[PDB]
Structure 1
Amino acid sequence: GFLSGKRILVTGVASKLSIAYGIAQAMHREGAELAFTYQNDKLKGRVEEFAAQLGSDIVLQCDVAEDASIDTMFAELGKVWPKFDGFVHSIGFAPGDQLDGDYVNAVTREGFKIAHDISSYSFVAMAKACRSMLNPGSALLTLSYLGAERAIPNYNVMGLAKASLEANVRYMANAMGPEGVRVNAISAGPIAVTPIRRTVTIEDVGNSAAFLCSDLSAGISGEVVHVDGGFSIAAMN
């Protein structure tokens, strides 16, 4: 398929409902060889079982809160994949207390710090940590949401962390372009007033993700692609 030849690392698999699960299934269908990270001991067994079903046995621990964790993960990867063709960053977090009601009242310095650190900084931290490992023609991808661009009730500080992440996509694309690396995002709909009259699925997101990490999207970099059924471009439906 249109990923045959490619070796792609997939973060963020936590359950069958994860966007990263949908992405991994699509990329495997299109012939990618896959590797996976897991955040912690809670998630290890689930990610091992899924990796095995997709024919992979590269499953490595990575907490993107820790620079040493990301470095150690990329040294372990380099033992089997001395070079590879990019990664899917499907990692987001804000403390639950941030998401409760009026934005100005809910936000705190620490909640802001954490949401930005995990949801935005970790994307470039990963790119720093593997930069010399990336083949020419590599592609990096991250997942964002319409909260980056609009004020969405309760989404709160995650909207700022997503706006930072989309700026990260542009700064990364511009910095790494000259070495043959593309960096994009998908702004996914939540997983009626939507033009396609349904919600998007992890299968929809997975197909677009596969495209965006493949040579088919050679022309596209620094872009935030809306995979939300047309929701964001409509009003008053």
Structure 2
Amino acid sequence: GFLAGKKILITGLLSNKSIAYGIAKAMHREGAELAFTYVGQFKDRVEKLCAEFNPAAVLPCDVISDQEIKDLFVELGKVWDGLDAIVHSIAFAPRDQLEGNFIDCVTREGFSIAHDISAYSFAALAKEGRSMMKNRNASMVALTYIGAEKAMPSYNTMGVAKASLEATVRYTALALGEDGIKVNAVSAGPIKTLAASGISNFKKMLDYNAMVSPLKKNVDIMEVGNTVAFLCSDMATGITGEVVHVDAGYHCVSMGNV
């Protein structure tokens, strides 16, 4: 596999349907040694889910806490000498932030919380993981949505946070490039997941994409997963600060619905 022997940490595995699950499948297939994080009381769920992937570790990390992030790389640094990649696949905003009108529903705290978890957490992982990733063609890949680029209904504060994430990807790439670390993001098309079912009429947003995009379809977690895998390989060492759209071509059209 093109990830043979590489040591990669995966965040945000929560379900059979999670994008992280797809990323894991791809990376396992390609021969990576994987470690997974989990939040609070999902310990048992995640341990069972990712068992099939032979993880070198399944450790607690709520990216709300600087302490846990620091402890993550302590515990991880015990079982691994160095680390080849980090996969950021974490997003949250309080539910009141995703209902209807952006200016109506937006709040100072919901804005803060969404950025803290969905954007800042990335540079945090980069901050603490940096020394384990020095000079070994290491890699970081964040997950983002086109809601960062264009104003959309319902996405609201999450869209603003995603924009924050993407700039952070860029500034993390400038910061970590001197250590040979590459930093990139995959902008996924909508996928039916646990985070996804946190918004109202998803089945049709998902059908709109299918109708209006060039390949007339939705992307699966393997399409996204396989792309993340590539971006953590020696093949992608010319690529950093980049956003690769995996959305069946949605990003490149306008009015494609005649």
Specify the TM-score bucket, using the shorter chain as the normaliser: over 0.9
**Unaligned ranges ≥5, structure 2:** 192-210
Query: Once the 2 structures are TM-superposed, how far is the Cα of residue 51 of structure 1 from its aligned partner?
Result: 2.7
Tell me which amino acid in the other structure corresponds to 2:44.
G
TM-score (norm 2): 0.90
Q: Distance in 1 between matches of 2:38 and 2:137?
A: 26
Partner residue in 1 for 2:186: 186
Q: Please tell me whether the aligned partners of residues 88 and 122 of structure 2 are also in contact (alpha carbons under 8 angstroms).
A: yes
Q: Please tell me whether the aligned partners of residues 11 and 36 of structure 2 are also in contact (alpha carbons under 8 angstroms).
A: yes
Q: Please tell me whether the aligned partners of residues 51 and 57 of structure 1 are also in contact (alpha carbons under 8 angstroms).
A: no
Partner residue in 1 for 2:49: 50
Partner residue in 2 for 1:220: 239
Identical columns (%): 59
Partner residue in 2 for 1:196: 215
Q: Please tell me whether the aligned partners of residues 15 and 49 of structure 2 are also in contact (alpha carbons under 8 angstroms).
A: no
Structure 1 runs of 4+ off > 4 angstroms? none
Query: Once the 2 structures are TM-superposed, how far is the Cα of residue 82 of structure 1 from its aligned partner?
Result: 2.5
Q: Distance in 2 between matches of 1:154 and 1:24?
A: 29
Is residue 2:253 matched to residue 1:234?
Answer: yes
Which 10-residue stretch deviates more, 197-206 or 131-140?
131-140
Partner residue in 2 for 1:175: 175
Tell me which amino acid in the other structure corresponds to 1:149.
E
Q: Please tell me whether the aligned partners of residues 51 and 58 of structure 1 are also in contact (alpha carbons under 8 angstroms).
A: no
**Unaligned ranges ≥5, structure 1:** none
Deviations 1:120-164 (A, max 9, x none): 000000111121111420000000000000001010011110001
SS in 1 for 2:85: strand
Q: Please tell me whether the aligned partners of residues 56 and 79 of structure 2 are also in contact (alpha carbons under 8 angstroms).
A: no
Q: Distance in 2 between matches of 1:112 and 1:157?
A: 6
Q: Distance in 1 between matches of 2:69 and 2:81?
A: 16
Q: Please tell me whether the aligned partners of residues 33 and 56 of structure 2 are also in contact (alpha carbons under 8 angstroms).
A: no
Q: Distance in 1 between matches of 2:34 and 2:228?
A: 14
Q: Distance in 2 between matches of 1:40 and 1:149?
A: 32
Is residue 2:182 matched to residue 1:163?
Answer: no
Query: Once the 2 structures are TM-superposed, how far is the Cα of residue 57 of structure 1 from its aligned partner?
Result: 4.2
Partner residue in 2 for 1:99: 98
Is residue 2:24 matched to residue 1:24?
Answer: yes
Query: Once the 2 structures are TM-superposed, how far is the Cα of residue 49 of structure 1 from its aligned partner?
Result: 1.4
Partner residue in 1 for 2:15: 15
Q: Distance in 2 between matches of 1:232 and 1:40?
A: 36
SS in 1 for 2:138: strand
Q: Please tell me whether the aligned partners of residues 48 and 57 of structure 1 are also in contact (alpha carbons under 8 angstroms).
A: no
RMSD: 0.8
Aligned length: 236
Partner residue in 2 for 1:63: 62
TM-score (norm 1): 0.98
